[PDB]
Paper text:
The main protease from SARS-CoV-2 (Mpro) is responsible for cleavage of the viral polyprotein. Mpro self-processing is called maturation, and it is crucial for enzyme dimerization and activity.
While non-covalent inhibitor MAT-POS-e194df51-1 prevents dimerization, the covalent inhibitor nirmatrelvir induces the conversion of monomers into dimers, even with intact N-termini. However, the fact that the covalent inhibitor (but not a non-covalent) might induce dimerization in a non-cleaved sample suggests that the trigger of the dimerization is not the N-terminal processing, but the induced fit caused by the covalent linkage itself. To confirm this hypothesis, we crystalized Mpro C145S monomers in the presence of Nirmatrelvir. The crystal structure revealed that despite the C145S mutation, Nirmatrelvir is linked covalently to the protein. This is like our previous structure of immature Mpro, with the exception that we do not see the displacement of active site residues Phe140, Glu166, Pro168 and Gln1896. In sample 1, the presence of Nirmatrelvir seen to strongly induce the formation of dimers from monomers even at zero hours and enhance the ratio of dimer formation over time significantly, with almost full conversion after 24 h. Our data suggest that the dimerization event is governed by the induced fit of the protein during the formation of a covalent linkage during cleavage.
Residue numbers in the entry:
A (entry chain A), B (entry chain B): 0 to 302
Write the structure that this text describes.
């Protein structure tokens, strides 16, 4: 409302990195940077292996010739392979001439990133996601989507933070950083696993209330202030993450761009949690939105 | 197969086309396809020209060298110019080597597309939009955003459908097709203009209810049916667009897939409007979503 919506990074730099990886009858997406392809290690599994894989043993059994990597029409010859945690690394005969400036970063719950959904190494769609407090993401992922990556771009530098591995029974998604470390208490085995009970990202809700004010949505503002302690007692009651002093400092700018003190805005949110929204919406939403970071609000508004 | 998200097309093919166009102190974006840069003609207005510009009189006073066109840090030499409706076409000395397979299409209200928001010829972010029934879009556009484009990329062809020109007093946006013809009764003049009252895109709400069913949710169905006439008589009391026999025909495939007759889903929507969601959500929304088309739903849930 008044010009504020979920925005993904332009995906071009990542599009030029997606490849298809095939091991026997198992196909998924790979990330091609320089002369290495990164993909989920579960590509080395047949359907039955996935039910209870011995990744050490399945990798000893494989050779370079067991991996087919396709970049558009061109087969890349695999000349080496290794595992790092839950990602397979395939050394190829050819460095990606579209490799962007990049790094691998591991993000914290509450942080947002752009997902390039891919199938058969072909980019399909882009959308914004937040790492939930329970380490899941609310993605849109079908069969063959594994190896799709999540990223942020700063100037010309792509920061890769997510590689897609699996779908939990609630329909939410679990994955790794690009070093193959899982976000959350999940394993790359087709076995009964479940998302923990989710919590709301308090600092992101406050950020979005700041976005509402900057966009002229002020009905929820009030004369009242509060303390972290009273507010955190409300937060806890309503399955909201504790608000930390560090969260307040991060919101500092917006507290000035709007001249409303975080603990002043905390009074609005407490009131909204206690008394609800009263038929009114905020930036077009009837729900309190927690998938915009303070950075995201500034990026989109002040940017 | 439970996750559903507003998903944009991967933007790489359009990113390679975005340039900066400057005339005097006025800078905005251009679309560089082969040896032509397409941009809003209002780049040739000064501060003084905004209320009642005569574009024919402003343009005839310009030389090729008055147009500064920048592709990254490379200056493109303008060797020609013409005006077509509200678009300027700048002939440059260099065909864009990144030109994708493209066409120009004029869309109807209800149609969706991806927007690549740009500033100074630099892509900023990508989001999904729909042409509203009142010929506006609910975009997120700031100063310098004019000449940002809307597109689809069904089947490796980029279809350019929108070029951004202006913001209306309610915060909605107005622009042209790539032939420079405005969507709606708008003019590229800082004259008192206002969006017509807007309506909800009924065929799209129904598509998204079909999406909810495909992804395993049916709580909102009921034992009733409706005539098309009775559906429209109720829906228009909630500011919904009339549903046409064309709309019913368009929903046929989604009807067939789910086993829910179009007019039975219509009966469900009539009850949804009457009752609200009673604390429930549909694909994570507390509101009825109208910016997914029947075609978008088949894209994301299947192909
Ligand atoms: C990668 N190509 C897919 C992506 C999945 C498929 C549908 N939606 C997605 O996001 N990854 C998998 O199929 C992984 C893979 C085996 C099983 N699996 C799952 O995602 C399964 N989920 C789980 O087993 C659970 F619940 F533990 F998360 C499935 C039931 C097929 C959705 C491996 C190795 C974990
Ligand atoms: C292109 N760079 C901008 C994009 C605008 C700026 C703010 N948000 C946007 O979408 N285009 C313009 O500034 C156009 C341009 C003169 C004025 N204008 C407007 O968008 C203005 N609005 C209108 O005149 C109105 F209400 F009629 F739509 C403005 C008040 C600056 C928002 C011209 C030639 C229309």
């Amino acid at each position: 409302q008044s010009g504020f919506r979920k925005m993904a990074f332009p995906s071009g730099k990542v599009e030029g990195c997606m490849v298809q990886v095939t091991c026997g009858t198992t196909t998924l997406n790979g990330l091609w940077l320089d002369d290495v392809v990164y993909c989920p290690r579960h590509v080395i599994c047949t359907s039955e292996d996935m039910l209870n894989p011995n990744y050490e043993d399945l990798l000893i059994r494989k050779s370079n010739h067991n991996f087919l990597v396709q970049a558009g029409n061109v087969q890349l010859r695999v000349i080496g392979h290794s595992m790092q945690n839950c990602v397979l690394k395939l050394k190829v005969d050819t460095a990606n001439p579209k490799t962007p400036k990049y790094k691998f970063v591991r993000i914290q719950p509450g942080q947002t990133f752009s997902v390039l959904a891919c199938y058969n190494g072909s980019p399909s769609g882009v959308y914004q996601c937040a790492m939930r407090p329970n380490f899941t993401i609310k993605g849109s992922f079908l069969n063959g989507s594994s190896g799709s990556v999540g990223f942020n771009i700063d100037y010309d530098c792509v920061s890769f933070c997510y590689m897609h591995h699996m779908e939990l029974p609630t329909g939410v998604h679990a994955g790794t950083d690009l070093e193959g470390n899982f976000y959350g208490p999940f394993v790359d085995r087709q076995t009964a696993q479940a998302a923990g009970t989710d919590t709301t990202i308090t600092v992101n809700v406050l950020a979005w209330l700041y976005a509402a004010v900057i966009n002229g949505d002020r009905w929820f503002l009030n004369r009242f202030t509060t303390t972290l302690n009273d507010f955190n007692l409300v937060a806890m009651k309503y399955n909201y993450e504790p608000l930390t002093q560090d969260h307040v400092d991060i919101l500092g700018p917006l507290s000035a761009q709007t001249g409303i003190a975080v603990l002043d805005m905390c009074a609005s949110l407490k009131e909204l949690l206690q008394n609800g929204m009263n038929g009114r919406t905020i930036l077009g939403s009837a729900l309190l939105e927690d998938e915009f970071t303070p950075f995201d609000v500034v990026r989109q508004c002040s940017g």
